[PDB]
Amino acid sequence: STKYPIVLVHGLAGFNEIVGFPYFYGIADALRQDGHQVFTASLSAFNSNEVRGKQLWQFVQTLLQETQAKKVNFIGHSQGPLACRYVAANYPDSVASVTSINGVNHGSEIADLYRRIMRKDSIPEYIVEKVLNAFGTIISTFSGHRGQDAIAALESLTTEQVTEFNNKYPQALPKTPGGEGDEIVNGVHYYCFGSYIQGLIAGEKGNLLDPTHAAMRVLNTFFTEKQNDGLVGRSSMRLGKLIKDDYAQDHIDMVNQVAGLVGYNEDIVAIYTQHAKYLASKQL
């Protein structure tokens, strides 16, 4: 097991209550079976990255007091990695590692497009309908409601807002776009994972029964970056040392969603347990 406890981090504080199961579906369970100490920080989605960073620091302070651990190994997804980067930047002595999994480390082109849609910035009406319906299909599958207050979550994840975030917290960002950052910055280890939607939809296996997957493929087509997971471009995910980012998976497939339904019979959970063992091998 890892020297320092693992902290799974995501945005959407209410996910577990509203949906009825975890954001990192089946992943904390798997990690505990391999003897790791695991905790989950569910952060507020409808505010800034810096506010989520402060929220996570308070979580971490309370966790460290309760574990007598010196540091934490962050594994984050989407929003999570930015909040992890805030804590690591400001409180490096308490952070053993930041692992970014499909993190919005340089902004989301879909977030950019939603702002344009909300501001009515000359977005053709046929495009407006495909994006909102794709988002509604994704949210309905989780919440169970049959019906776009989601702008609240995407506001902080635009290319403009994340560029501003990166300006304050540049640690471990790649010098060249789509490249690799420094593995160790100020004592803290940084790693990234990623994915992008690949292949024709027919050969997706498990995802054929996941209504969110077709929705992610619609959103995929509106990116300027062709390699994207439906919400984030491949290059935008990069932070610190790359492990692997060519998985044929959409954004939520990489957190084993919906409820285990993923692409191409890939063992998503094994990505997390193998990385946990890798962290252990690095004396973390």
Active site (annotated) includes residue 267: no
How far, in Å, CA of 240 to CA of 191, rounded? 5
How far, in Å, CA of 116 to CA of 123, rounded? 7
Least spacing, CB of residue 80 vs Ca ion, in Å: 19
- Is 186 within 8 Å of 92 (Cβ atoms)? yes
How far, in Å, CA of 263 to CA of 189, rounded? 30
Pick the binder of Ca ion from 112, 245, 253, 266 (CB under 5 A).
253
Is 157 one of the annotated binding-site residues? no
Residue with structure tokens 């209504």? 211
Is 265 one of the annotated binding-site residues? no
Is 228 one of the annotated binding-site residues? no
Q: State the number of binding residues for Ca ion (CB under 5 A).
A: 4
* Binding string, residues 10-39; x marks residues near Ca ion by CB under 5 A: ------------------------------
Distances (CA, A) of 168 to 50, 85, 128, 129, 216: 10, 10, 33, 36, 31
Active site (annotated) includes residue 251: yes
**3-state DSSP call for residue 155?**
helix
Q: What is the dihedral of CA 18, 254, 187, 169, to 10 degrees?
A: -70
Q: For 144-234, where are the alpha helices, taking DSSP H only?
A: 151-154, 159-168, 211-220
Q: Which is nearer to Ca ion, 109 or 253 (CB)?
A: 253
- Is 238 within 8 Å of 174 (Cβ atoms)? yes
Cis status, amide bond into 258, omega within 30 of 0? yes
Percentages helix, strand, coil for the chain, rounded to the nearest 5? Answer: 45, 15, 40
Window contacting Ca ion (CB under 5 A); options: 8-16, 97-105, 141-149, 209-217? 209-217
- Is 55 within 8 Å of 22 (Cβ atoms)? no
**DSSP type of residue 70:** S
Least spacing, CB of residue 24 vs Ca ion, in Å: 14
Indicate which residue of 42, 78, 94, 100 is catalytic. Answer: 78
Residues whose CB falls within 8 Å of the CB of residue 62, separated by 6 or more in sequence, listed in order? none
Is residue 210 a contact residue for Ca ion (CB under 5 A)?
yes
Is residue 204 a contact residue for Ca ion (CB under 5 A)?
no
Pick the binder of Ca ion from 261, 268, 269, 279 (CB under 5 A).
261
Active site (annotated) includes residue 106: no
Window contacting Ca ion (CB under 5 A); options: 43-51, 52-60, 64-72, 247-255? 247-255
Window contacting Ca ion (CB under 5 A); options: 74-82, 83-91, 155-163, 253-261? 253-261
Is 267 one of the annotated binding-site residues? no
Least spacing, CB of residue 118 vs Ca ion, in Å: 27
Is residue 266 a contact residue for Ca ion (CB under 5 A)?
no
Least spacing, CB of residue 249 vs Ca ion, in Å: 8
Least spacing, CB of residue 101 vs Ca ion, in Å: 15
* C-beta nearest to Ca ion: residue: 210
The binding site for Ca(2+) consists of: 50, 207, 210, 253, 257, 261
Q: Which residues are catalytic?
A: 78, 229, 251
Residues at the interface with Ca ion (CB under 5 A): 207, 210, 253, 261
